[PDB]
Structures are given as structure tokens and as C-alpha cells.
């Protein structure tokens, strides 16, 4: 029952500006056998289905821009976006993939300054 | 000599594919296998070249060009004891399928969606090796059937199993037509003194 | 519209994709709050997986012929009313995480 803590509450980003958002897990989400970190990054636009942007934190989703790049080591997981656009603004969430029960520790609104 | 195994009236299902049962008696064969396994009653129809499901794609797979026979008989005493027999296991789900003519004796946990399964069970990880319910108090479809599948193959090596079917009897001293192994002719047949090697 | 203590059934069918997924998911999100996982379903043997928070209030049934996942909700409350989203899970996502249905609970 590992709760995940994601900060900050708000992200102010200008158009065409790189941003970094980090989600921290209480226990390491790396499976010992495969030595691979497990985590999922989600985009949540208003009136839209929850959508997976990055999986395992090592593989980009199909038809997803290289601007969205995520690197996570051990407990700490970091997602970096560049060239942010008005369509891109959404709530960003981190979902543990390591073990049941699944915990949605995702939590970051994106705004335009 | 498969002619004595057809009219015995002791097998519940004696079918073949491609090669007719009345034609493989006088035909050579390079090597004949012997695939014996015990399944249920509803899984007998799935043992056919070109089927799919949870048994033919995870246990015994049949080739596309299978030209053999399927021997299966009813049984309830040579493989099912009193109180239920749970000695015959089977694989229900796996990460990949099985190629034709391939055995698998490994034991791994199936992975459904997340939670990679490698030596740990519980959530998102299930035990694939189940057990058949061979009980004498069940219906007809739940009865065990000892299916023995025979495989026929032909290679470039000389076949050691060979021999044609029965033919007409012999006659002597008369003028006759004859056919010895395809040597058609006409003449008089007798014994001979000839010292053939 | 469900009164407190009523039973609510929600069904969703994947469109453009025919099964080919080893998990199905249920998520409850109240407006102004993050998504919360509820239960996971398995196509063959039932996963029967429920979150500890939702345990005893959620039942999962899957019918292959129907091709739609079923979720039963019991002991509904004003806090319970939220948008629930049908989802799935294969390797990653393949148009499997579907949309959501708003729930309103009042006498």
C-alpha cells in the first residue's frame, strides 16, 4: 500500500519553455529480477479520458512527441516536457507499475504564464 | 500391419488424416512416432490439424501437413481411481504458443497485464498448471480418453518398415499368367535346383 | 440518479479493438481530485481484484459473449458520487482506457 507523493501543486510554464515535474515513491519501484524501474505518466485534459504518455519511464508511447521525455532512478521519477503548447496543458499523474495494489500518485496541473 | 487394429471393435475413435486406413498397410514408413496423452472428452475434437483454443495452442500442437492417424478409446479404470484422479496436469495459459512436435516440462507463472510474474504468485499472477476432473460419477464429456497420436514422416533415409498386402495364391506346372512384385508375364512355373544367394 | 444504498451497474465496450488485452481497469475520480484505481479484471479466470478502500462495495463480472466489462456498486453515498472511467491494460495503452460516466447520488 505504497502511497506516492507528487509535487508541486501548480506548474506555470510559458509556450516553448522546457519544464521538469517530479513524483516521489515511498518504496523503490525497480523490480530486482529485470533491474528496470516501473512507473506510468498520465495526461488529463478537461473532458478527456485518462491517457498514458510514458510507460516504464524508458519507452515513449506510439505517436508521442520526443519533447515529452522522462527519466526515473529508484524512488525518484522525473518527467521533462519542452515546447509546451495550450493543447499540451493537462493534469500530470504518476502511477506505480511495480506491485499491487496499484496506487495513483500522479498529481500536477499544468498552466500557461 | 494396421489391418488387425481396425476391425477389433475396441477403440472409440479411430480416425486418420490424408492417408486412408486401408492404404497404409502396404506402404513403407521411415519412422513412426508415438504421442500418448490423456485428455478429457470435449478436447478430442480440438486434436486436429488446424484448430485453436486453450489446449491445442498450449499443450499438444498438431502440424499443418499432418498425414497420420488419431487413436482414442474410452476408459475410466486405467486412468481414473475412486474419489477423483488429479494426477494429470495441463497448461492453460502461457506467454507464448508451442510449435508442432515440441515438448515443455518447465513451470512458470503466467503474466496477465501488470505485476511481472517470476517466482511470485498472488495478484495478477495465476497458477497455469491445473488438474483434470477425472471422476467416475461425472457425465460422458468429463470421461478420460487415452489418445495415442501416431506421426508418419518420410526422409531421404531408407525406410526399414515396409511390406505389401496379401495377394492371390500360387499355382505350378500349368501354363499361367503371373505377376511377381509387378513382374508381369506368361509361362510355366515349377520348383528349381537353382542355388540363389 | 441513484439513492444512498442503491445498486449501480456500469458497462463499457472497447471500440475498434477486439479483446486482445489481459487486464481491464476501473477508476473513480471526484471532480477536483486525482484518479483513484478501483479494480482489475482478467479475461479467463476472474481477477476478482478490488482496492482495499473499495473492497466490499465493488463486484467485477466479465462476459466474453457480451464483450463489455461489468462493475456493480453498492451502499452508494454523497461522497461516492464521482465520474467512473472504464479502462484496460495490455503492454501499455492501445485505445483501451475509455471515457467516464458521471454519477449523481441523491434521494
Q: Are A13 and A85 in contact (CB under 8 A)?
A: no
- The C-alpha angle C79, C80, C84, rounded to 5 degrees, equals 130
Judge whether A59 is closer than 8 Å to chain C, CB to CB: yes
Beta strand spans in chain A (E): 4-7, 10-13, 19-25, 30-31, 36-37, 39-44, 51-55, 59-60, 69-73, 76-81, 91-96, 109-112
Instruction: Using the CB atoms, write b or e for B57-90: b if 16+ within 10 Å.
Output: bbbbbbeeebebbbbbeeeeeebbeeeebeebeb
Judge whether B111 is closer than 8 Å to chain A, CB to CB: no
Judge whether C97 is closer than 8 Å to chain A, CB to CB: yes
Judge whether C89 is closer than 8 Å to chain A, CB to CB: no
Which residues of chain B make contact with A34, given a CB cutoff of 8 A? 116
Q: Identify the CA nearest to C37 among candidates A13, A2, B161.
A: A2
Which residues of chain C make contact with A51, given a CB cutoff of 8 A? 93, 97
B145 alpha carbon, distance to own chain's centre: 13
Domains identified in chain C and CATH numbers: 8-102 (2.60.40.10)
Q: Are C69 and C27 in contact (CB under 8 A)?
A: no
Instruction: Based on DSSP, count helices (H) and strands (E) in chain A, helices before strands.
Output: 0, 12
Experimental method: cryo-EM
- φ, ψ for residue C68, nearest 5 deg: -125, 135
Q: Note the helical H segments in C18-104.
A: none
Q: Identify the CA nearest to B46 among candidates B151, B149, B152.
A: B149
State this model's resolution in angstroms.
3.3
The parent domain of residue A73 ranges over: 4-112
* CATH code, domain carrying A53: 2.60.40.10
- Domain count for chain A: 1
CA distance to partner chain B, nearest, from residue C101 (Å): 24
The C-alpha cell that represents C38 in the structure block: 478501483
Alpha carbon distance A23, A95 (integer Å):
9
Which residues of chain A make contact with B122, given a CB cutoff of 8 A? 100
Amino acid at each position: 500500500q505504497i502511497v506516492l507523493t507528487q509535487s508541486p501543486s501548480s506548474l506555470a510554464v510559458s509556450v516553448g519553455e522546457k519544464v521538469t515535474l517530479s513524483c516521489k515513491s515511498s518504496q523503490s519501484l525497480l523490480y530486482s529480477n529485470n533491474q528496470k524501474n516501473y512507473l506510468a505518466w498520465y495526461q488529463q485534459k478537461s473532458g478527456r479520458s485518462p491517457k498514458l504518455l510514458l510507460h516504464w519511464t524508458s519507452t515513449r508511447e506510439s505517436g508521442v512527441p520526443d519533447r515529452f521525455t522522462g527519466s526515473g532512478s529508484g524512488t525518484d521519477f522525473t518527467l521533462t516536457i519542452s515546447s509546451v503548447k495550450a493543447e499540451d496543458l493537462a493534469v500530470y499523474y504518476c502511477q506505480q507499475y511495480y506491485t499491487y495494489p496499484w496506487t495513483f500518485g500522479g498529481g500536477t496541473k499544468l498552466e500557461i504564464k | 500391419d494396421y489391418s488387425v487394429l481396425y476391425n477389433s471393435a475396441s477403440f472409440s475413435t479411430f480416425k486418420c488424416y490424408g492417408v486412408s486406413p486401408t492404404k497404409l498397410n502396404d506402404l513403407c514408413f521411415t519412422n513412426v512416432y508415438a504421442d500418448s496423452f490423456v485428455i478429457r472428452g470435449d478436447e478430442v475434437r480440438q486434436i486436429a490439424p488446424g484448430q485453436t483454443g486453450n489446449i491445442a495452442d498450449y499443450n499438444y500442437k498438431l502440424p499443418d501437413d499432418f498425414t497420420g492417424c488419431v487413436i482414442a478409446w474410452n476408459s475410466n479404470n486405467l486412468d481414473s481411481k475412486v474419489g477423483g484422479n488429479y494426477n494429470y496436469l495441463y497448461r492453460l495459459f502461457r506467454k507464448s504458443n508451442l510449435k508442432p512436435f515440441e515438448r515443455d516440462i518447465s513451470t512458470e507463472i503466467y503474466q496477465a497485464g501488470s505485476t511481472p510474474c517470476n517466482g511470485v504468485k498472488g495478484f495478477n499472477c495465476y497458477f497455469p498448471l491445473q488438474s483434470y476432473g477425472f471422476q467416475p460419477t461425472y457425465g460422458v464429456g468429463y470421461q478420460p480418453y487415452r489418445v495415442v497420436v501416431l506421426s508418419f514422416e518420410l526422409l531421404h533415409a531408407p525406410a526399414t518398415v515396409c511390406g505389401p498386402k496379401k495377394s492371390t495364391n500360387l499355382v505350378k506346372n500349368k501354363c499361367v499368367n503371373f505377376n511377381f512384385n509387378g513382374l508381369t508375364g506368361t509361362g510355366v512355373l515349377t520348383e528349381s535346383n537353382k542355388k540363389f544367394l | 440518479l441513484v439513492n444512498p444504498g442503491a445498486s449501480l451497474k456500469m458497462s463499457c465496450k472497447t471500440s475498434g479493438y477486439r479483446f486482445t488485452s489481459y487486464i481491464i481497469h476501473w477508476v473513480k475520480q471526484t471532480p477536483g481530485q486525482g484518479l483513484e484505481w478501483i479494480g482489475a479484471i482478467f479475461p479467463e479466470n476472474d481477477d476478482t481484484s478490488y482496492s482495499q478502500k473499495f473492497k466490499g462495495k465493488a463486484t467485477l463480472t466479465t462476459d466474453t459473449s457480451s464483450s463489455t466489462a461489468y462493475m456493480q456498486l453498492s451502499s452508494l453515498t454523497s461522497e461516492d458520487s464521482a465520474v467512473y472511467y472504464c479502462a484496460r491494460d495490455g503492454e501499455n495503452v492501445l485505445d483501451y482506457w475509455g471515457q467516464g460516466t458521471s454519477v449523481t447520488v441523491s434521494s
